[PDB]
Amino acid sequence: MRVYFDNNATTRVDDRVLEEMIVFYREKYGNPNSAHGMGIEANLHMEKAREKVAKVLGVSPSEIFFTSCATESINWILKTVAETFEKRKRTIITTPIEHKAVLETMKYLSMKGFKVKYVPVDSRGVVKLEELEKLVDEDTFLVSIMAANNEVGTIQPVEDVTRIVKKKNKETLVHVDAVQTIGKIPFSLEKLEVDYASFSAHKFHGPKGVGITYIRKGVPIRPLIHGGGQERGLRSGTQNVPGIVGAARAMEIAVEELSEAAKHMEKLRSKLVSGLMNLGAHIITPLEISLPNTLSVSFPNIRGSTLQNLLSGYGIYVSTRHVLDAMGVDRRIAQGAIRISLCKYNTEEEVDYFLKKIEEILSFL
């Protein structure tokens, strides 16, 4: 029995999404920048996609840009926006629980002479709003925060973070790494009042190689990739049409079925929680404020990587620090931590299997 419990890492493409993609690989394979019939045709579907996305996120088609992945989007927004504020501003604010896409870019901007401050998080993984108000000064031009954490699943108070920031400084811009929202928790930008958002299609049953970017009309931005002039001159290179069509279709479906999907995952998760604790596990994920599919747990007397290998031997897939560290998690617990991340297609039959097999692995040890 193949049990895939690592959906925060990546997911399988939805059969419906793949079917549509195939059309643009075999038949409508034209270059959206061409003026002939097939060019005109591909461009239509690329734009319908951009529209499907804008609609789901509650924004204007012109505010959606397509990249190669969330990482590229994050590099692009952080690097070029910092680039527009050179010799004018220099303070950037973020948190220690961000994905390395963000953290590593910040490290880069520091090398370049930028001041990168880090707002701490509480024991549950939630950013500390009080410290945020303080840390934000007049020299602060950009605040980069994530909507939910990929390792533990902790949801951040994006609304509050935004409000608190606007008050302390009305000119500061806000970027939201929303990669883990789509298909797991509602996320709309319509009234969120943020300026930049990043997404990765393969995290919600879309294909790999496609990133989705939200850039509020008017805010600063520049090309990370100069060239032919695609994406309104802001991101060149031939667009990935089969990829874009699929990504849009995947977002639409993912959100459309969110409600029923979350309830289902929320249920399976509860079964895992009680079962794992009865076997001796420690629950790191704060159930009351996290993605309903994410469950980070630890068996103190076993290396997470060892539990990971054993489980993999039975056809079960899960994953296995700077986040737990930022949370103050004890080194012993961190060392044995693993992450179980469920999708809409996981089942109770699978949960029963995981519980049954991990109990064996634990007994043999």
Ligand X SMILES: Cc1ncc(COP(=O)(O)O)c(C=O)c1O
- State whether residue 114 is helix, strand or coil: coil
Instruction: Tell me: is residue 308 an annotated ligand-binding position.
Output: no
Site string for a second copy, 255-294 (x = CB under 8 A): -----------xx--x--xx--xx----x-xxxx------
- State whether residue 211 is helix, strand or coil: strand
The whole-angstrom separation of Cα 285 and Cα 297 is 7
Are 308 and 338 in contact, with CB atoms under 8 Å apart? yes
- Choose from ligand X, a second copy, none: what does 312 bind? Cβ within 5-8 Å by kind: a second copy
Instruction: Tell me: is residue 238 an annotated ligand-binding position.
Output: yes
- Choose from ligand X, a second copy, none: what does 84 bind? Cβ within 5-8 Å by kind: none
The whole-angstrom separation of Cα 234 and Cα 55 is 21
Using CA atoms, how far residue 144 sits from 122, 148, 162, 178, 268, in Å, is 18, 13, 10, 11, 32
The whole-angstrom separation of Cα 290 and Cα 287 is 6
Strand partners, 215: 196
Q: Give the distance between the most distant pair of CA atoms in the chain.
A: 67
Quick check: 315 binds a second copy (CB under 8 A)?
A: yes
Quick check: 128 binds a second copy (CB under 8 A)?
A: no
Q: Which helix (H) or strand (E) holds 77?
A: helix 70-84
- Choose from ligand X, a second copy, none: what does 101 bind? Cβ within 5-8 Å by kind: ligand X
How many residues of this chain interact with a second copy, rule: CB under 8 A?
26
Q: Interface with ligand X by CB under 6 A: which residues? A: 69-71, 99, 101, 146, 150, 177, 179-180, 200, 202
- Choose from ligand X, a second copy, none: what does 364 bind? Cβ within 5-8 Å by kind: a second copy
The whole-angstrom separation of Cα 365 and Cα 363 is 5
- Choose from a second copy, ligand X, none: what does 186 bind? Cβ within 5-8 Å by kind: none
- Choose from ligand X, a second copy, none: what does 270 bind? Cβ within 5-8 Å by kind: a second copy
Choice between 42 and 333, CB closer to a second copy: 333
Choice between 158 and 310, CB closer to ligand X: 158
Quick check: 1 binds a second copy (CB under 8 A)?
A: yes
Instruction: Tell me: is residue 49 an annotated ligand-binding position.
Output: no
The whole-angstrom separation of Cα 11 and Cα 219 is 32
What's the token pair of residue 213? 């970017």
Considering only residues 214 to 243 of the shown chain, the ones binding a second copy according to CB under 8 A are: none
Q: How far is the CB of 308 from a second copy (least distance, A)?
A: 9
Using CA atoms, how far residue 282 sits from 43, 105, 147, 160, 340, in Å, is 51, 33, 24, 30, 13
Instruction: Tell me: is residue 180 an annotated ligand-binding position.
Output: yes
Is beta strand 282-283 parallel, antiparallel or unpaired with respect to 294-298?
antiparallel
Residue listed under structure tokens 């939201």 = 176
Q: How far is the CB of 323 from ligand X (least distance, A)?
A: 10
Binding residue numbers for pyridoxal 5'-phosphate:
70-71, 99, 180, 200, 202, 238
Binding site for a second copy (CB under 8 A): 1, 124, 266-267, 270, 273-274, 277-278, 283, 285-288, 305-306, 309-310, 312-315, 357, 361, 364-365
